[PDB]
């Protein structure tokens, strides 16, 4: 059989497994038949072009559907009272009740309500009309076409890059720092000052008249004469109304700090100076490494020079290890991307940048949950692909006595102390929670163990939170740090001391307990991933694991039993802990913000100290409207979310039987079914081409994990959206 | 103001180009 | 199933192809390809 | 067996158990909601689990608190 | 088909050959051990990969190792 | 060199007793390429799933043992 | 024989705890107004709240095994 | 009897005896001095 | 000025309102009054329950420091007696049999000698036989 063309051993398989594994190893280019390094790199280049084109097409589709079936031009007239529309509904399976229920947001047909928060983003960046959205969609279509053609071209024989071109770290770093990061940020700052701010102040600026409309009145002379302060004079007053000329200043680069009084979001001019400054810094950074002139650093000598007397060989030979190994680079990139996605979530829920996005609680919750889940997935993938590197691309002799080898030396100490910290957190956190539960249940909630989060409150004070009376640093009015004449200090101190936003929310004993539980989850997931990565090469039970690859089922029932001794199994186990930690995180965030938005912070404050309050006040209480989306009486707009809630519960349940029941049972059952088919008249005329067999052990684990994760995500998303929409939306 | 039917049809026709380019890229990558 | 957006007749014809015609054609082509014995 | 005991409990509460008035009228524990709710899974989830779990989630501070504790223990 | 390898740490206890249910292994004369015999895998196309030979091996680490590879009808042990 | 009763440390780097200490139960003097027999107090993982014991004896070459006694 | 001995010990314990720590004599006079109860909880760490009011001035854990009705039927 | 002494000294008997000793200590202390949140 | 959000329980209106109806934990009829008295000196939140402050300050040493020292002493006692008994039985002829059948005489002899566990531990560390060298421990292949 032809398929799969990249693996002969799979193509000669006569069973249905050939269909499955061929899918699973399709995009693993290294293990393909007759694969060279150069071909691998070029194929990766083309595939990355493809993913970029897919991203651009997805964004174009978002824009086009919003412009076509949305209410963008009506939404901007009243962002605080109109639900944005995602896309239209066309379902012949609908009934009259569903049609009436889903005709919402002033539409004339069944429509969905957008929760990605793209309306606020488009409004903030200056898009105000449907035709602008349409032009953006068409331009993104053209851009995706260009990138697809670029992939095809650089895949052609005359345009195939050489191996040396791919292994040019210095030139890539210089171009991608100064150009990709710096020039793009500078262009965004120029877009903000030339277009976004004038449109926010009522002046319409487009391609038609942006050449005849200067950003600043006395423009482009002070920048070259050095009198930059002119661009900071006359900022937007506190009475400014977004999108109008009432109370609007003329400054284009400010450091006001805090939030816009009306939109409850960061000042646009602050964003302009911020992106300009980081563009300048990135452009400076991009002139660091030597490419083909005399000046510039070289990464290899920097790495080979930083060696100490305690670590042995230090960072020697690390340049070759990183450059020759693609999995090392992928793991580093995934770790960094996950960290900065977590950063995006944490600094975006507390410092909103888009106008009126702080008042749309549903979109805020959705965005936080989404980007935090993405960050968790990326953080898991970093460790997984690092373990893959250790299995495949790690050379012990080359990286001898350096830090990479030193990691595998005290790996037992690493795992032991990690196990100790995980157990130490878990025991004394579960003990405190159960103690509070038991004490509260016995009718004496006064004997609870409530620890004030003193250190985090001290940090809040050091940033300027004057509620705990710590009187330290920025909270100290006489401290040198608070008497530097910083232009952002008044606005920042005003915003931090206001209780109307999420900027440094007040904390208590429940936040202490839940943050320590999150710490337990993080350390346990790290323990699983790290032990898998370090034991991937081998352990006492399997000294020769590297010979068996990264993912293998087991080594049989002998020598104890094996049963998930591979590093792929470590990743598979760590996915569950990642999901559990993300669940705790999102539960804490959502309940705290429900209390904040309703003004009933005391409910969370006094009910989060014991687990029964979590079970009753959060889960039981907030499901009242969700599960009533469709009743024996009728149907409301939350019907789809109730259906998806049950759907997620069902898929989560279904994953359990790929996770618990194992292969031999189903193999024998399929044997019986095969007998039944072969012995049946009028069905013997039809025969299979691939012999039906049960799913393999690793495939079964993967499928169970997939159903599990899909159910988890769908259930929580449905519950969160339904609860927040019913409460506030 | 809301779009027109001609705009939607033109968007479809424009999107017909990245479809052809993506088909070519997929065939090239399969090779 | 009835909409007020411009060119509301498009989903009347586009969705079925994405619903039935495209999935069925893709099923048939992939099934033939993965089952085509030989030549690799 | 879980489905069996759930069916028994809900049907007993909805169609048999209850209070009889001196007139003779019968008011059931959960009224006649079994007939029109037990046909969908959402009905089983909302009118049986969520509705009737109130007495076990609100048991803290009273003589039934132990049950509530044990409830969580199971979970 | 799967691969079966026998390393020079074999002591010629013949437990692996006895434990094999599909007659894949054999005992051939040798000189490296006191028993002067070592295991062999001539009929390796019939191996299913049950790892019974590995379970039977008493050395500190298995002197006989089985590496699962391409899957055939025989390797899957199918009766249909 | 290694005789009966010799306490030796194992340096096979893949055996269960790498770094552990054992005692020389016997040495066979011929062309055998793993002539030393070392027995240990601890037992390895050898055995079917559920077995209550492992193996406390193994064969090693002379070069992979360090005399301690 | 051993399992029979264990079951006999269980039955004797049930009868003793229904004879000493129960309101069976109280419940017998007023069966429609007194809840059965045969387990009493020591007050040590606040678990004395489990000793709810089962009627008739008796404080104890309500039983659901139905031993009181069996004993009344047995005479 | 020596056999009875050896049986009494087995792991489960020792672990349960020590657990009841500790539990009795804690219960008696909590009875005679309850509600000790901190050293006052 | 520390803990501006935490007030003394002796004046917090919520604590005083809720302390009248404190439940009796034991059979003693005035255990609730004793608890209210003992907790009136703590730092109550807006909901009237005591809060423990753990930052190193000695004014609130009773919250963490004293129980910490008590637990550390007890846990060190337990660990030291267990380790000493293990090392002692390791020289016998059936160390595993004495693991499941406890040598009660020797067990209690080690039980009663654990109150000087810090001095024994520091002498052990100085003698160098508390911690084994890395080259004398079996290790898994890297
Ligand atoms: C990936 C982006 C994306 C997505 C998810 C959707 C989603 C949808 N569109 Mg849509 N659309 C998009 C981009 C997108 N659109 C773009 C860019 C255009 C301009 C050409 C349109 C034009 C369009 C029209 C004219 C109509 C829809 C309709 C619909 C709905 C019916 C289902 C469908 O797509 O089939 C029908 C739609 C198409 C087949 C449009 C072609 C798809 C685009 C052009 C290419 C996307 C390729 C994509 C990246 C492939 C990813 C591969 C990956 C899955 C492995 C659905 C909500 C219908 C609707 O409103 O029903 C209520 C409808 O009538 N779309
Ligand atoms: C019998 C049940 C049923 C069915 C058939 C549908 C069908 C539909 N609903 Mg719907 N709905 C239902 C019940 C149902 N609904 C219920 C009970 C509710 C709650 C009241 C809703 C609420 C609802 C809303 C709110 C919306 C719909 C929409 C839609 C349409 C989406 C178009 C589509 O699927 O293309 C897109 C197809 C896909 C995305 C495929 C995804 C599934 C596969 C498995 C993923 C692909 C995996 C893999 C890569 C496949 C490889 C390729 C393959 C060929 C091999 C479609 C007509 C939407 C609509 O009208 O917009 C057009 C919409 O907005 N429905
Ligand atoms: C100035 C020259 C230049 C530029 C612009 C690029 C640009 C790019 N190169 Mg590149 N490259 C260059 C020179 C350059 N290269 C040279 C000289 C070499 C040879 C040494 C290479 C060799 C090379 C290889 C080998 C590869 C690339 C690839 C890529 C693409 C990766 C996708 C990406 O990062 O974009 C997306 C990311 C960004 C735009 C910035 C990252 C986002 C930041 C970090 C955080 C987010 C900021 C902000 C908050 C997010 C916006 C929020 C908003 C949505 C609201 C990208 C388009 C890859 C590819 O295949 O692409 C086709 C690839 O594999 N490059
Ligand atoms: C830029 C990101 C990136 C890139 C380029 C790669 C690249 C690679 N990874 Mg990697 N990985 C990543 C992120 C990434 N990964 C992350 C974030 C994780 C953590 C989740 C992993 C976890 C991971 C593991 C555990 C393994 C790889 C492997 C691989 C290699 C090839 C096998 C493969 O993935 O194809 C095959 C991929 C698939 C068959 C994916 C199937 C899963 C589908 C997409 C789920 C679909 C869900 C379903 C449709 C939901 C329907 C919903 C509907 C009902 C509504 C390849 C080098 C494998 C390897 O060792 O190769 C060297 C391997 O074992 N990766
Ligand atoms: C609610 C369920 C639950 C719980 C409590 C645990 C608990 C634990 N898991 Mg775990 N796990 C779970 C679900 C759970 N897991 C699931 C679903 C998966 C996916 C398969 C995993 C996958 C997983 C992996 C892969 C790993 C763990 C690890 C751990 C340990 C880390 C230490 C810790 O968190 O606190 C400390 C432990 C606790 C708080 C639990 C003790 C709780 C009891 C009540 C203490 C008292 C015992 C009691 C007196 C016994 C009486 C019994 C008697 C009545 C018969 C711990 C034992 C890691 C580990 O071993 O770390 C060393 C590890 O590597 N687990
Ligand atoms: C993905 C797109 C899609 C679309 C556009 C439809 C559209 C439709 N489905 Mg449907 N369906 C879908 C996916 C889809 N389905 C999926 C994925 C499932 C599996 C769960 C089903 C399962 C399903 C059932 C079980 C039934 C339908 C029925 C129907 C029809 C009811 C409306 C009507 O007036 O009936 C009458 C409509 C016609 C007579 C027109 C026939 C359409 C052309 C002419 C056929 C050629 C309608 C044409 C019903 C039906 O077939 O009614 C006859 C019905 O009983 N659907
Ligand atoms: C199934 C049988 C059963 C069960 C579950 C109970 C359950 C109970 N009885 Mg009860 N009882 C039973 C049979 C049973 N009884 C019988 C047959 C009699 C008649 C003799 C009694 C007479 C009786 C009285 C007189 C009292 C109870 C009480 C109680 C309650 C307190 C628990 C208790 O006594 O522990 C108390 C704690 C202990 C016994 C711990 C002591 C240490 C133990 C024994 C450790 C065991 C090992 C020990 C070191 C000895 C070593 C042995 C080794 C050689 C093997 C509890 C609800 C009390 C109650 O309800 O008061 C309100 C009470 O006062 N029972
Ligand atoms: C960052 C974590 C951290 C750590 C490790 C410590 C550690 C310590 N603090 Mg401390 N403290 C912290 C944060 C921390 N503090 C913060 C954030 C505050 C402000 C609320 C304080 C306010 C504080 C006071 C007021 C006092 C301590 C004291 C102490 C010491 C107590 C000595 C003892 O009992 O043993 C101990 C070294 C005591 C001291 O001076 O010890 C010398 C003391 O009186 N702490
Ligand atoms: C907030 C998180 C806090 C917990 C995270 C992890 C806690 C782990 C701390 C244990 C000590 C780590 C091992 C020390 C590592 C070790 O001692 O390496 C030796 C190293 C001294 O390095 P040298 O100056 O010899 O040279 C190192 C470099 O020159 C190149 O290797 O010590 C440090 O750098 C300590 C700082 C590491 C941080
Ligand atoms: C000796 C002994 C053993 C062994 C012991 C060993 C080997 C111990 C080894 C320890 C090592 C290697 C490292 C230890 C590190 C300890 C640290 C880092 C302590 C930090 C303390 C801090 C940060 C105090 C913090 C604050 C201190 C302050 C008083 C307040 O609270 C507030 C608060 C909590 C912030 C056993 C286990 C075998 C048996 C035992 O019985 C005895
Ligand atoms: S994974 Fe399955 S086949 Fe492998 S050892 Fe475990 S039970 Fe046996
Ligand atoms: S794996 Fe099984 S079939 Fe293959 S050689 Fe070993 S015992 Fe024989
Ligand atoms: S079981 Fe191991 S030692 Fe014995 S003959 Fe087979 S390979 Fe050699």
PDB file of C-alpha atoms and ligand atoms in Angstrom, chain A residues 553-557 561-564 662 697 701, ligand 11:
ATOM      1  CA  UNK A 553       4.541   1.141  25.167  1.00  0.00           C
ATOM      2  CA  UNK A 554       6.466  -0.800  27.813  1.00  0.00           C
ATOM      3  CA  UNK A 555       9.083  -3.518  28.275  1.00  0.00           C
ATOM      4  CA  UNK A 556       6.642  -6.280  29.174  1.00  0.00           C
ATOM      5  CA  UNK A 557       5.452  -7.653  32.510  1.00  0.00           C
ATOM      6  CA  UNK A 561       6.144  -4.675  35.169  1.00  0.00           C
ATOM      7  CA  UNK A 562       7.367  -1.507  33.380  1.00  0.00           C
ATOM      8  CA  UNK A 563       3.949   0.004  32.476  1.00  0.00           C
ATOM      9  CA  UNK A 564       4.620   3.604  31.329  1.00  0.00           C
ATOM     10  CA  UNK A 662      -6.761  -1.742  28.020  1.00  0.00           C
ATOM     11  CA  UNK A 697      -1.343   0.964  23.893  1.00  0.00           C
ATOM     12  CA  UNK A 701      -3.345   6.552  25.959  1.00  0.00           C
TER      13      UNK A 701
HETATM   14  S1  LIG J  11       1.665  -1.749  29.459  1.00  0.00           S
HETATM   15 FE1  LIG J  11       0.302  -3.545  29.136  1.00  0.00          FE
HETATM   16  S2  LIG J  11       1.610  -5.049  28.034  1.00  0.00           S
HETATM   17 FE2  LIG J  11       3.023  -3.499  28.918  1.00  0.00          FE
HETATM   18  S3  LIG J  11       3.630  -4.380  30.926  1.00  0.00           S
HETATM   19 FE3  LIG J  11       1.840  -3.033  31.335  1.00  0.00          FE
HETATM   20  S4  LIG J  11       0.049  -4.437  31.216  1.00  0.00           S
HETATM   21 FE4  LIG J  11       1.793  -5.539  30.251  1.00  0.00          FE
END
